[PDB]
Amino acid sequence: GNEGAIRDKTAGRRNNRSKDVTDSATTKKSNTRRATDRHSRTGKTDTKKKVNQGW
Amino acid sequence: ENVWFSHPRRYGKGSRQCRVCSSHTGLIRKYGLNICRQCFREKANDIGFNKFR
Amino acid sequence: KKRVFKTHSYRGVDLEKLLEMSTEDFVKLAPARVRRRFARGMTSKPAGFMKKLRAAKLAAPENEKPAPVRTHMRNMIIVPEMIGSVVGIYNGKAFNQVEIRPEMLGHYLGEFSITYTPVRHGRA
Amino acid sequence: MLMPKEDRNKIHQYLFQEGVVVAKKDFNQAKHEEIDTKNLYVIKALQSLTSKGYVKTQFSWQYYYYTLTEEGVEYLREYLNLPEHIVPGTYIQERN
RNA sequence: GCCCGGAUAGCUCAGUCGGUAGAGCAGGGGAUUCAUAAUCCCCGUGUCCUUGGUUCGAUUCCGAGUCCGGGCACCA
RNA sequence: GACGGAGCCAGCGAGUCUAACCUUGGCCGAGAGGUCUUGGUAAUCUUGUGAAACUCCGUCGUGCUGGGGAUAGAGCAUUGUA
Ligand SMILES: [Mg+2]
Ligand SMILES: [Mg+2]
Ligand SMILES: [Mg+2]
Ligand SMILES: [Mg+2]
Ligand SMILES: [Mg+2]
Ligand SMILES: [Mg+2]
Ligand SMILES: [Mg+2]
Ligand SMILES: [Mg+2]
Ligand SMILES: [Mg+2]
Ligand SMILES: [Zn+2]
């Protein structure tokens, strides 16, 4: 509880300030996938009969 | 009978909706219309809101 | 000796009187927000609580802290009548057991139960 | 649902007489306009009544429009006993 | 069984006049893509081996010891 | 240019029925606000919305200064069950 929280060193600002900052902080967007956007993953395909029945 | 199943609903986003669609969000409250914006765009013609400028 | 130290004073009132003063007279001497809270809402609030509370303080095994009394009422203002009690002050999970001191008068229960774990950046 | 037969009779009777019901989609009402019962009772009783034929339900803008069907007329006719050809919204008022 | 080579972030690898610790790889996360890649960023990270000594200041200048790494199957 | 008197001018809006919305005026209050009344379902009442930059007469005088107002302490009120 609150006694805990004030008494706990390894807490508060000074302690953080003195730690190194990770590199994933200064990362970048990620992106993951995009030049696959037009490439269908479904592996299924339709078929000229089904399409011709539909449309 | 069950004295356990309501908390205030007098005011805030929780106190209203869309007369059209229940949605609590993005509500048009002006002129007492009380339509959510998505709906209001679909109804604005039948209400009498047209596009001039 | 003689001078058994000396009591506390809330805003110029030593314990003694404060303890048997009345909740209403207490908030009378409290500051703005308190006086407001008490001003509105006078219909059933810290109700069965105090009863239980006092009962626990009676069921106390002498010369010792009364058993904890759990609540969720983080919004409840600390007033003389609850001095020297032990309260499980919920923070979300967990009721943080807290004893109430003379110098806690007028603060909210929720101040004494922290609601998040500190932080600790970097580290491993 | 779960409701004392008396309220079920208020619903069924009102319904037979009127031949039509409306209820705002809002459970937790406690009493609905007209019929002297919980809105929840109306809505559910009706819903049931419908899913076994008897009534058609329309929804539109949060509102439930309840329509009594022919087979249904027969049914509540049974439930309130009232002899074959009793009534409903099935006669043209005065000459209105 | 030698001698050889090491030790610091998980790991691989830097370092110090002795002031306050780094880098890669790993990891975690964004950006770029209809979605993944690539790419382009972000982040986080440390029982300075044990083991003692020296020293205004030592991871960091030594020493002792232990895991080990490289090469070779018990002649005073 | 900030401060302080004083001058003092817009346009587009909106507002309460089975309800508590826009609010003038009178008092009380340093202020925030309070209180008694009031007009308006409105080109009618709030409202000429007397808005702010701006104008004028002063104070300051180049100094982190009276530029700047972050952070923080104490007290008072308003919305709200909180
Ligand atoms: Mg409800
Ligand atoms: Mg917590
Ligand atoms: Mg896409
Ligand atoms: Mg001026
Ligand atoms: Mg005063
Ligand atoms: Mg009036
Ligand atoms: Mg005008
Ligand atoms: Mg300066
Ligand atoms: Mg200033
Ligand atoms: Zn809607």
Side-chain angles (χ1 to χ4, degrees), chain A, chain B, chain C residues 4-124, chain D residues 1-83 88-89:
Chain A
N2 287 44
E3 177 83 341
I6 30 90
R7 276 287 153 85
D8 176 74
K9 353 82 125 60
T10 107
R13 255 269 304 187
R14 209 188 223 90
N15 260 333
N16 281 346
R17 212 54 209 111
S18 78
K19 269 42 170 64
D20 242 336
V21 167
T22 166
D23 255 65
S24 46
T26 185
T27 353
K28 298 243 274 185
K29 112 284 313 301
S30 198
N31 176 259
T32 319
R33 181 283 298 234
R34 251 308 233 247
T36 82
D37 205 18
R38 304 210 54 124
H39 284 15
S40 186
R41 7 208 146 90
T42 345
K44 283 207 171 184
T45 231
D46 268 335
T47 150
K48 271 181 233 84
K49 153 156 159 257
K50 243 164 44 256
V51 199
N52 286 337
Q53 299 292 250
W55 301 96
Chain B
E1 303 166 350
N2 292 11
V3 235
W4 42 77
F5 220 64
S6 272
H7 163 107
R9 215 91 67 170
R10 302 185 266 247
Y11 66 96
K13 303 239 176 191
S15 67
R16 29 190 155 71
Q17 52 190 26
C18 185
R19 21 150 96 266
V20 178
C21 72
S22 330
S23 185
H24 288 274
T25 290
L27 209 203
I28 296 291
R29 224 141 79 63
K30 205 187 205 182
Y31 315 128
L33 52 167
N34 291 276
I35 304 286
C36 93
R37 81 207 167 73
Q38 289 85 322
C39 279
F40 172 77
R41 265 175 36 92
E42 298 163 344
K43 301 303 196 196
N45 223 246
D46 295 332
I47 305 174
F49 281 91
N50 292 96
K51 280 256 278 165
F52 288 123
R53 195 168 58 96
Chain C
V4 280
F5 184 52
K6 204 70 210 301
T7 18
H8 179 77
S9 55
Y10 178 48
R11 279 167 194 285
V13 200
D14 295 17
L15 268 247
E16 295 211 52
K17 0 187 174 157
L18 279 167
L19 287 8
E20 292 155 72
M21 205 174 44
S22 94
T23 277
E24 29 153 9
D25 293 275
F26 173 71
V27 358
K28 237 94 129 292
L29 76 152
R33 176 105 249 160
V34 170
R35 298 161 14 219
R36 181 183 242 272
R37 219 294 241 308
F38 283 90
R40 354 172 74 242
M42 277 169 169
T43 125
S44 291
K45 24 204 314 254
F49 189 73
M50 305 289 195
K51 291 178 73 275
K52 254 176 190 160
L53 196 298
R54 201 186 304 100
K57 195 131 164 178
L58 165 145
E62 277 18 67
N63 223 0
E64 202 172 356
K65 294 172 160 187
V69 178
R70 317 160 150 224
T71 176
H72 273 180
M73 287 206 63
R74 298 181 57 83
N75 82 338
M76 202 209 295
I77 284 289
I78 287 145
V79 35
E81 196 197 338
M82 45 179 40
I83 281 195
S85 255
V86 168
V87 196
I89 299 163
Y90 199 64
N91 69 15
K93 45 214 260 150
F95 305 87
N96 283 312
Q97 265 188 235
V98 189
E99 145 167 70
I100 301 294
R101 247 188 314 280
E103 32 269 335
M104 290 177 183
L105 289 176
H107 292 249
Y108 287 110
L109 269 200
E111 308 199 61
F112 301 91
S113 185
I114 233 275
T115 71
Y116 53 98
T117 37
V119 59
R120 319 160 204 292
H121 270 321
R123 335 292 243 270
Chain D
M1 207 199 126
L2 187 51
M3 85 191 78
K5 74 142 73 61
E6 153 185 17
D7 298 48
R8 187 79 119 254
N9 284 15
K10 295 158 125 153
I11 309 283
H12 280 62
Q13 127 149 8
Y14 166 103
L15 176 51
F16 189 99
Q17 149 186 288
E18 294 304 305
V20 122
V21 182
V22 318
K24 177 180 45 223
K25 179 148 173 253
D26 168 53
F27 335 102
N28 306 19
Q29 241 206 26
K31 248 115 179 65
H32 107 122
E33 323 72 354
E34 318 212 330
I35 318 172
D36 188 33
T37 70
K38 285 197 170 95
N39 206 21
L40 202 280
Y41 291 7
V42 175
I43 296 196
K44 285 299 139 187
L46 257 315
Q47 157 151 119
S48 172
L49 242 313
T50 121
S51 70
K52 59 221 269 207
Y54 310 169
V55 13
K56 106 87 179 262
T57 302
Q58 253 301 358
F59 192 73
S60 193
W61 292 45
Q62 300 314 105
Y63 258 95
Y64 292 128
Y65 297 66
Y66 294 128
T67 281
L68 189 34
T69 81
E70 303 189 348
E71 22 228 30
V73 169
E74 260 179 9
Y75 182 93
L76 356 308
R77 195 172 274 159
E78 228 304 296
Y79 187 35
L80 315 138
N81 58 268
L82 30 78

